[PDB]
């Protein structure tokens, strides 16, 4: 027997960026007790009086956005534990957003990571969901791993442990964000949905849901930089490379357990990326 793991993605983008505590790069957003950083290693936790979310103190037109994450192990029904890029205060009511999102679980269920796109409102009212969920080929509350959204005018790509789980190439302006972005992540209770589409909820006897984030990486852009500035390479040359798309398709044959684009009681017109 050996250790069966997606193979080499031949090259490490989050290696290539700088790691930055926490406070150099983000504030916390709301429920600021619920929140500590610990020589830039962040906690943050839900219970029955609060969750927590935070926001990165800059304003995004491209990048590479990661952190390294730990998640509780146990009983976390109905607790979603994010890292996602959002513009709803800037565009109430009609915003872009992309996703990061650790469905809580019960013992003996793996954790599901589900990933989602939103553009112009297809997140706020009537909701137009552009979901794949993975499970983790690792426990991902064992230790610390690599998540992140890579964000460009030209591409989304996900990575865990850089490893590319899914891309969302730009196929036109409607289906597309492209409009500023910040970051953010919190940990809160989805009970309604979160697990098994709301079977299991959470259970506060099993508080405090403890989130944490270290290793915060920013190969980005400001919105106003200079032109010249470019986000993070994802790759040496440019383009997921043949090792990254093989990787990429073992997670997705391997791992992935929904996709929006292969559900028959979806109505596919509404989202014609697929």
């Given at each position: 027997a050996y250790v069966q793991g997606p193979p080499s993605p031949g090259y490490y983008p989050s290696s290539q960026i700088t790691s930055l505590g926490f406070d150099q790069g983000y504030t916390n957003l709301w429920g600021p007790q619920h929140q500590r950083v610990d020589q830039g290693s962040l906690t943050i936790w839900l219970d029955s009086t609060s969750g927590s979310g935070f926001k990165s103190i800059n304003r995004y037109r491209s990048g590479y956005f990661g952190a390294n994450i730990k998640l509780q192990s146990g009983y976390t029904a109905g607790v979603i534990t994010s890292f996602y890029l959002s513009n709803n205060q800037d565009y109430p009511g009609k915003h872009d957003e992309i996703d990061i999102e650790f469905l809580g679980t019960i013992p003996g269920k793996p954790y599901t990571l589900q990933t989602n796109v939103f553009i112009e409102g297809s997140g706020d009212y009537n909701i137009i969901g552009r979901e794949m969920r993975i499970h983790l080929w690792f426990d991902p509350t064992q230790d610390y791993h690599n998540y992140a959204i890579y964000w460009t005018p030209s591409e989304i790509i996900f990575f865990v442990d850089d490893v590319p789980i899914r891309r969302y190439p730009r196929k036109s302006d409607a289906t597309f964000p492209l409009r500023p972005l910040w970051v953010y992540g919190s940990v809160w209770d989805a009970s309604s949905w979160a697990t098994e589409n709301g079977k299991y909820k959470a259970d506060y006897r099993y508080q405090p849901f403890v989130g944490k984030y270290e290793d915060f990486k920013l190969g980005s852009c400001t919105?106003?930089?200079?032109?010249?500035c470019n986000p993070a390479s994802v790759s040496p040359y440019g383009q997921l490379s043949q090792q990254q798309v093989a990787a990429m398709e073992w997670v997705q044959k391997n791992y992935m357990v929904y996709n929006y684009c292969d559900?028959?009681?979806?109505?596919?017109t509404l989202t014609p990326e697929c």
């Amino acid at each position: 027997a050996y250790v069966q793991g997606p193979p080499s993605p031949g090259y490490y983008p989050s290696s290539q960026i700088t790691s930055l505590g926490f406070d150099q790069g983000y504030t916390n957003l709301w429920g600021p007790q619920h929140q500590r950083v610990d020589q830039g290693s962040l906690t943050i936790w839900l219970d029955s009086t609060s969750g927590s979310g935070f926001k990165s103190i800059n304003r995004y037109r491209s990048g590479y956005f990661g952190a390294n994450i730990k998640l509780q192990s146990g009983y976390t029904a109905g607790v979603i534990t994010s890292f996602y890029l959002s513009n709803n205060q800037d565009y109430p009511g009609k915003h872009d957003e992309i996703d990061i999102e650790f469905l809580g679980t019960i013992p003996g269920k793996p954790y599901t990571l589900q990933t989602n796109v939103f553009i112009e409102g297809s997140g706020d009212y009537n909701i137009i969901g552009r979901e794949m969920r993975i499970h983790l080929w690792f426990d991902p509350t064992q230790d610390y791993h690599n998540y992140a959204i890579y964000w460009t005018p030209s591409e989304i790509i996900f990575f865990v442990d850089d490893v590319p789980i899914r891309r969302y190439p730009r196929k036109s302006d409607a289906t597309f964000p492209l409009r500023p972005l910040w970051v953010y992540g919190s940990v809160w209770d989805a009970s309604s949905w979160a697990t098994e589409n709301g079977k299991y909820k959470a259970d506060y006897r099993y508080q405090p849901f403890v989130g944490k984030y270290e290793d915060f990486k920013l190969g980005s852009c400001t919105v106003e930089a200079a032109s010249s500035c470019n986000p993070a390479s994802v790759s040496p040359y440019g383009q997921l490379s043949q090792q990254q798309v093989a990787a990429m398709e073992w997670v997705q044959k391997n791992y992935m357990v929904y996709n929006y684009c292969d559900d028959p009681t979806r109505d596919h017109t509404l989202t014609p990326e697929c």
